[PDB]
Design a protein around this ligand. Structure first.
Ligand SMILES: NC(=O)C1=CN([C@@H]2O[C@H](COP(=O)(O)OP(=O)(O)OC[C@H]3O[C@@H](n4cnc5c(N)ncnc54)[C@H](OP(=O)(O)O)[C@@H]3O)[C@@H](O)[C@H]2O)C=CC1
Length: 313
């Protein structure tokens, strides 16, 4: 019954993952929220269909997305089986292991045991032969980096992942990971990190610069900073200081013909080293509003120095 829009590649822009021939849509769709046990199945399908119809080819999951850890993967597995499997070779599907998935010493952090056992569970829940990208979800300083990276390499060499990625790494540790995956001859093309007007962590921990200097992509998540970079906290007449930052940023957005959310998405994409911005949605209208932003990623030196002075604590 679902037939992907014939116009789905007409507007979206696609960007190389650093030096790689792998291209992400400039807007990627994440299943962190609204795909869990309590989610409505018809709404989840419509969100996926809306995403793909607008040229979003990348669906981002993790083992523990729900809630109930694994529910998002199982739900996406059902959407694939029922309607999207037809288009599987047009989709990039990711999953991850590295945060808490199940109880006990093998269900969190980083070991080869957890990472590989988790990937098998993810493939079973999603009904896939492989994921396009398999990520180490966060750094584990208590496991040798060589062990976690060799686990990603085993995933790729076992035909269970096309490419390796890492998430939440700093610049120094990303460099070490890149060196290990290079020596293992394991495709490694993408970093997934939190980035917004209100979260400059990757500008200060070396990740944004290390990714660019080593030809690795970046996919930015939480670009709307927990609803603070949306209309949610705006009036038409939650510290007083935060509401003021939001009021002034929204004025910069209005002058650009954008909502605050739209400008927040455009800002994360302003620099070429950021490959894609990862959005969420509860309703299709949010996808449709957000996909216009890929066409306004340019900012004047004035807009930028104002956004920085306003966002500065
Ligand atoms: N450690 C990691 O690697 C992590 C990665 N991620 C990835 O990033 C993805 C996105 O993260 P998330 O924080 O949800 O992303 P965003 O910062 O894009 O927030 C998404 C939410 O913002 C609201 N929203 C979206 N578009 C609009 C709009 N145009 N106007 C107003 N409100 C809007 C909706 O919430 P509502 O309708 O309820 O207001 C939506 O559910 C996740 O799904 C996941 O794939 C995220 C977290 C951790």
């Amino acid at each position: 019954k679902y037939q992907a829009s014939k116009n789905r590649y007409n507007e979206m822009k696609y960007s190389k993952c650093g030096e790689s021939g792998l291209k992400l849509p400039m807007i990627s769709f994440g299943l962190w929220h609204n795909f869990g046990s309590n989610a409505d199945y018809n709404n989840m399908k419509e969100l996926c269909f809306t995403a793909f119809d607008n040229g979003i080819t990348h669906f981002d999951l993790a083992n523990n997305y729900g809630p109930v850890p694994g529910s998002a993967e199982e739900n996406f597995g059902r959407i694939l089986r029922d309607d999207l499997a037809t288009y599987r070779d047009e989709l990039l599907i990711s999953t991850k292991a590295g945060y808490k998935m199940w109880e006990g010493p093998y269900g969190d952090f980083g070991s080869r045991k957890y990472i590989l056992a988790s990937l098998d569970q993810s493939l079973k829940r999603m009904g896939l032969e492989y994921v396009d990208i398999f990520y180490h979800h966060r750094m584990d300083p208590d496991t040798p980096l060589e062990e976690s990276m060799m686990a990603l390499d085993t995933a790729v060499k076992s035909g269970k992942a096309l490419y390796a990625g890492i998430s939440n790494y700093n610049g120094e540790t990303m460099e070490k990971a890149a060196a290990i995956l290079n020596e293992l001859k394991c495709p490694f093309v993408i970093n997934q990190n939190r980035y917004s007007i209100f979260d400059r962590t990757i500008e200060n921990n070396g990740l944004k610069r290390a990714a660019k200097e080593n030809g690795k992509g970046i996919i930015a998540f939480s670009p709307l900073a927990q609803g603070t970079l949306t209309d949610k906290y705006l009036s038409g007449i939650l510290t007083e200081k935060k509401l003021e930052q939001i009021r002034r940023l929204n004025n910069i957005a209005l002058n650009r013909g954008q909502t605050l959310a739209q400008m927040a998405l455009s800002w994360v994409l302003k620099d070429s080293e950021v490959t894609s911005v990862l959005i969420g949605a509860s309703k299709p209208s949010q996808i449709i509003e957000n996909v216009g932003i890929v066409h306004k990623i340019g900012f004047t030196d004035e807009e930028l120095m104002m956004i920085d002075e306003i966002s500065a604590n």
